[PDB]
Design a protein around this ligand. Sequence first.
Ligand SMILES: Nc1ncnc2c1ncn2[C@@H]1O[C@H](COP(=O)(O)OP(=O)(O)OP(=O)(O)O)[C@@H](O)[C@H]1O
Ligand SMILES: Nc1ncnc2c1ncn2[C@@H]1O[C@H](COP(=O)(O)OP(=O)(O)OP(=O)(O)O)[C@@H](O)[C@H]1O
Ligand SMILES: Nc1ncnc2c1ncn2[C@@H]1O[C@H](COP(=O)(O)OP(=O)(O)O)[C@@H](O)[C@H]1O
Ligand SMILES: [Mg+2]
Ligand SMILES: [Mg+2]
Ligand SMILES: [Mg+2]
Lengths: 232, 98, 183, 52, 240, 209, 219, 97, 240
Amino acid sequence: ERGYSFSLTTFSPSGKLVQIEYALAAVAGGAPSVGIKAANGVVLATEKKQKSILYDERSVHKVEPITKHIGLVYSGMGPDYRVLVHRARKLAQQYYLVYQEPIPTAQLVQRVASVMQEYTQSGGVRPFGVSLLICGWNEGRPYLFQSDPSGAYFAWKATAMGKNYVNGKTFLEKRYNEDLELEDAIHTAILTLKESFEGQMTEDNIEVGICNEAGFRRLTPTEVKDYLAAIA
Amino acid sequence: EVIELPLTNPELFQRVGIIPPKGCLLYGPPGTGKTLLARAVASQLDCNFLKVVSSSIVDKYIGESARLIREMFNYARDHQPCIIFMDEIDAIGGRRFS
Amino acid sequence: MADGGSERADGRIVKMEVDYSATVDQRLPECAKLAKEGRLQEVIETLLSLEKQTRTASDMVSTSRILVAVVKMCYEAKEWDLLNENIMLLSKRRSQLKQAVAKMVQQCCTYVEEITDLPIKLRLIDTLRMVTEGKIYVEIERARLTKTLATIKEQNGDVKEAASILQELQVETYGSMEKKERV
Amino acid sequence: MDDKALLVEVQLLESKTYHALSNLPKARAALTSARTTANAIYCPPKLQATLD
Amino acid sequence: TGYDLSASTFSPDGRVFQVEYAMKAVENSSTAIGIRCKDGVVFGVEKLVLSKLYEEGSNKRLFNVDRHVGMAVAGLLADARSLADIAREEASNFRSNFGYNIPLKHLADRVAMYVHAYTLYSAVRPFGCSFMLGSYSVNDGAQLYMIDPSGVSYGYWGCAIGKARQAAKTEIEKLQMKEMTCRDIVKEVAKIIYIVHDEVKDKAFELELSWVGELTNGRHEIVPKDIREEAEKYAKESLK
Amino acid sequence: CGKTMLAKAVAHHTTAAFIRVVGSEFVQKYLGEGPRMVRDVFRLAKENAPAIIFIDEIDAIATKRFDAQTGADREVQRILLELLNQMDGFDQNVNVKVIMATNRADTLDPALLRPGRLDRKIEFPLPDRRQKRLIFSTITSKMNLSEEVDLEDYVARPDKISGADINSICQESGMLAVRENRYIVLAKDFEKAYKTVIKKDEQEHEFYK
Amino acid sequence: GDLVGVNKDSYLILETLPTEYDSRVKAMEVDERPTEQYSDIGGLDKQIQELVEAIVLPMNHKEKFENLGIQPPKGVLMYGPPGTGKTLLARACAAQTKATFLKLAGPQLVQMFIGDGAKLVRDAFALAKEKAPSIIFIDELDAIGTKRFDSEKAGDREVQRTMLELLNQLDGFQPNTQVKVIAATNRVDILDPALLRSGRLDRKIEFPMPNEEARARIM
Amino acid sequence: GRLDRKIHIDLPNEQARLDILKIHAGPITKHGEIDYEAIVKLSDGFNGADLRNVCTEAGMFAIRADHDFVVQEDFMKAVRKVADSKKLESKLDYKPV
Amino acid sequence: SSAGFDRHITIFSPEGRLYQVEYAFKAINQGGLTSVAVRGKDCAVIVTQKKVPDKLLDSSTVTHLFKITENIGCVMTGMTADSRSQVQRARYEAANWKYKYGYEIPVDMLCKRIADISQVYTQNAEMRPLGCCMILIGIDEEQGPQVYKCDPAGYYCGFKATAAGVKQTESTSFLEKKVKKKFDWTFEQTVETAITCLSTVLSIDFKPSEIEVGVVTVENPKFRILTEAEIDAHLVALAE
Ligand SMILES: Nc1ncnc2c1ncn2[C@@H]1O[C@H](COP(=O)(O)OP(=O)(O)OP(=O)(O)O)[C@@H](O)[C@H]1O
Ligand SMILES: Nc1ncnc2c1ncn2[C@@H]1O[C@H](COP(=O)(O)OP(=O)(O)OP(=O)(O)O)[C@@H](O)[C@H]1O
Ligand SMILES: Nc1ncnc2c1ncn2[C@@H]1O[C@H](COP(=O)(O)OP(=O)(O)O)[C@@H](O)[C@H]1O
Ligand SMILES: [Mg+2]
Ligand SMILES: [Mg+2]
Ligand SMILES: [Mg+2]
């Protein structure tokens, strides 16, 4: 068959791209998320909620490992997340085949952003509807990055995304600093996620990921319950 | 259970400690018997029973449309056991415009 | 339906006396499913009356032996369960449990002259958990008064019995009582 | 930092310790500061009674 | 409006409109019925004569798909011929690949998938033909299937398509077809088509009958002329 | 959300005069009655005592746009103008207080809210979490609830209940108890009544997020 | 509610007058008959018979229905592409029958003052009820029957509210069995479903374009 | 507080369609065996107001051909004469909110 | 709420939504049928209803259950042709996985591959996103029974009790009420609960000829369809 071969994203009379704005508006309605780094590693926290008790909470995951030391979380549309995850895995594989070394974080961020940008200029397609957070630990210094449906990216110390992201950023403004440890970072991440959380926070509604110079991994529900207790 | 019982055996609800509902609406697709039900109730329940279609209580003079409603509720208040049935209330109950 | 149960009753009236209470279980289903029918206004009530008479006869025979307290509780719980499985409100609009409770009350008041702890105190605990419903309010009164009176006379004591009798604040509320008895 | 309730608690504690040491003006001033800093809390479910 | 211009737009209530328009295009075809017997199937088509100039045997609507499989079509002739050709090529391909005559449960499915492939995209239009496939095998008995332009195929004991489909199936159901051999079925098929399409609607017409079953040792062909003559002679008696 | 119960409670507990009217009673078939029926109310309240006036559903006569060619709009305009004049004529000495209630405040004429006429705006929002427990406790303190029914099970539930149908929850559960010829409420009654009244499924496509 | 004539000065009652009807309703009654025998119609042999058996036979042969325990049909709609013989059939039927015939058109009921239209509707039914065997014909029905809808800024309501009176003189709370209703339109995808209900419009005849043999007969 | 209970009145289950057919069919001088279950199986999504029409059409089919009784074939014609005319009625169901 | 061609193709509306996909969800309900799936301690059950309105139609070919693999079974709802096409794609994908990796395919990978295939239709503006649902049941080593569900928007998940069709909401409510009690689950109990759920949602009290049941268990992981006799056996055992 064939496609259409004409761009669906065009310039308005006021010099603005409408579709990117609508994609950002769709992103703003997703599940909230928070990300922090303090001098030793990075913490990614996200909130998950099944509609009823029928759903199995251990069947799918939000935090996904690209490789041994890169982590990624999302906010926005659901199905579009897997395509980006799969593409990132492929890209890391070609990099490792060519150079025989684990990929640096910045290169992976740049390549993923390039794909996401290219997806808004071709013909007969519509842009993605997610916003990503990427974390890693290479050569000692930890790294945190955030993407954008338009393809741009930034580097952050602490970031909040999803619903009520403005309140999260203001809250992090008066709390975060440049010298803490991973445990206190976890404490403040749960504290700031409690701002818009549900009535009762259980050990299964929350997913937490930690990166240190030992590798990326996803916290099991037991220690998540341990952290939820003795706090708040 | 709503219109017949608390009209004739009122102390039960007093004992339990509640006041019975005042009214209910019948809804559903066309032709499923909504008027036939009210005809049967009217024919086989001994009470006082006013019955009107809401489309025909309107007229062009400046205030009659509200006066008539005040009149019919006064009439019901004087004749103490009574039922008000009025049909097709979407004719006047519509959402209020801006 | 109606006369088939009469024939079965006239048949097993002797069998129950000759046999043990196990056949009661064998006679439990066939009557209970009849309450499922409920096709006529008075057949089901007479049926359940016959079966309640059978249950009270078995209770008398059992409490005559050591099966006084350990099996009466099972009897009452099973009859409540049979009501649950059959139509609610005990099969029909008629209480169809009022007669059972009244007969058991008569047995408690008169037959158990030797009111040992298990024969009377336990039987009252069992029968006072049918208190909640309105249909049988009058009996739960008489039973409450009898319980308090027995406790007072036999053991003396005080305060607790007074508290028990007071809690029947519905004495005023009960419509269908003789005025003098209320007084 | 973020925490404001603990500020209310310690302010009330200083109010109590000044009052027990028989220094009325400073105790009243500390209580006033605690009241001002306790008016912005979303809900002090039990602390409100102690303050009052 | 405008929700009913492409084949790739769901209407607000959630259904496709072009396929429904194809359906309404089918409902103006003439008529065609087909019923299965104890040991085969029988098709029947009434063909209208528009003017005296045309010759008998023109534009047959009873197509022969394969050496043991037959087809009867209703709708637009051009699309019907295209479908017949694609089914014929597919059957030959199957015989070449594996090595034996294709069963109905596979051929009907493949043609149904190919027809359904033309209802998703906006670059092509849906087909406009509804057709019936019939066959008989010694190891599988008689088989009858019906396929509609939306892409749905079912199995039937007897079916009718065209204008007076329901009127025909009314007298179809009265028959106890489950028992008799399809030697006497020809007379009742002729009778059931002469009891429809009043002469007020059109002046003249003609009958086309097919035949397949164990009686022909697996081959599919038109009925002999004398048998059809006797069948219509019997069917004329409905004037009583 | 209970705008009228404040009026009822203050009417019960007051020590001064009270007057209540409905905003839609002023329009009259005989022309010229509306202004008179406004000015006499204000005169009576003025000369009587430290009175309080209450008007319910002011949307009937106080709206924004008009059409000066139909008769009825002219009459309503005259009513509103005279009401503004009469309210403005007070001399900050008489002790008369005016209460007005409305349902949709967006369709109101702005000139009615100018300073000196209606200087206080009070909002009655939906109960959230703390008011639910209090409303359940106060409504159910009258009934015969059995010592087995939990209320914290129903309060914590997410749905945005108003204040006008918690009463309906309790009332319907009582009716379920009455149907059984039993005079004590059980937990299953609240469970079934709460299921019956709300009846909201999801409307919540879950690939949104 | 009775209407009485009164002495101007004492106000003593002096007469009882006949009931009065709006003159706009008394004007929609035919008086000089059309003159079109069914001979002047070609091709429509089915639809003529399906009309006549539905709204003429129940007038003359009452026993033929009573003697079997049935109710005659309530009313007929006829629809189809413009230029087919609908209004021609209405004129023919009016020319053959003896009964009182009322002729009406939908747009004529749209009136400026609120409530003035419903009054005309019920007054027309009330007039027909008095002339025992009367029949009533509504043309251009699609001017009234447009589907109701939901709106929050502004919308149309007065015509909807007269339609809800029409839908109640047919069927409704008290059955009327004495007057026959015909209605006509050329578009049906417009109309409100609650109007199409089986109890109100009972036989829905449809008119096709003439095939080859009918055109010869028309010419 | 103003309208306290809301009572949904809905299209009949097949058992109810049998009940209503037995109601409206009775007075007809019907003749020979009749099998209502076929009718109940064909009529799907019918209103109560359509089954009355089926019963009227059945007799209308027998006023033609000069009979004075009804037979099951008439019901089986009338069912389909009605059932296909519902195609031109909109299919929406509306519900309060 | 709309501006431009957002109502006709799959692009974002101003609020951030897109309607050409949520129209398919209400296109699901066009069939007017409901299916239920239950998972037990060591078995999984799929139950559905079937309706045959006419006697002429052959009742042996109206099944909605399909054997995707000797160990994995499925049930479909919605438009028939789309469901058949999705069945075809699933069969091909499972066979390809077996060819390539040399061992049987897990159910979750199959569901993910199907959902990823379906997600493209809601990304490009020239296709229509296939309004048909998906339910699969299977057995996995060290996990036991597994029940997964897939939708036209590309959202797959793993459930413990599922219903798909017209009566989805109240059936899920009833299943939740039953499962909150946390009682032991065996084969007979699971089948009884699954049947009674549909029986009380529809209020039919039906016969052993109007439903279909499929079951899998850890004694013969082959997917099997219950015969009418044993279905009647469960039905009578349910009614004491
Ligand atoms: N459940 C039913 N049982 C018996 N007859 C019924 C039933 N439902 C409808 N009918 C028939 O419907 C006809 C009149 O319908 P009815 O007056 O009930 O309309 P309705 O359902 O209230 O419609 P609408 O919503 O348009 O007012 C009568 O012939 C009556 O016999
Ligand atoms: N403490 C309470 N707070 C709020 N509502 C209550 C409370 N106690 C009872 N209610 C219920 O609130 C309902 C609201 O009644 P009310 O007439 O006051 O409403 P309203 O807000 O004036 O409504 P509207 O503007 O629609 O007339 C009452 O019928 C009562 O049952
Ligand atoms: N046999 C016929 N069939 C159809 N139309 C006819 C026939 N004979 C005459 N006509 C023409 O049909 C017209 C009738 O108007 P009509 O088509 O009914 O308007 P509408 O259908 O919009 O009501 C007349 O002008 C008449 O000349
Ligand atoms: Mg009605
Ligand atoms: Mg109020
Ligand atoms: Mg005309």
